[PDB]
Each structure stands twice: as C-alpha cells, then as structure tokens.
Amino acid sequence: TSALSLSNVAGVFYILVGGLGLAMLVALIEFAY
C-alpha cells in the first residue's frame, strides 16, 4: 500500500485554516460589540 496519502490531508488543512480565518472574522465582530 505504497501511498502515504499526504497531499489530500494538506488540502483539508487548507480548508481548516480557512475555517480559522472565518472564526477570527466572527471573533472581531464579537470583540467589537
């Protein structure tokens, strides 16, 4: 099963970091008001 499948999870890492960006986006309006 030679494949280690490391790129795909890097993809879901990209969507995770995106979700963190949106999280900070909500955090700003939450700390503003």
């Binding site: 999280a23 900070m24 955090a27 939450e30 700390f31």
Partner: peptide, 4 residues
Amino acid sequence: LVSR
C-alpha cells in the same frame, strides 16, 4: 484569541 476569542475569549481574551
């Protein structure tokens, strides 16, 4: 970051 969200709490404090």
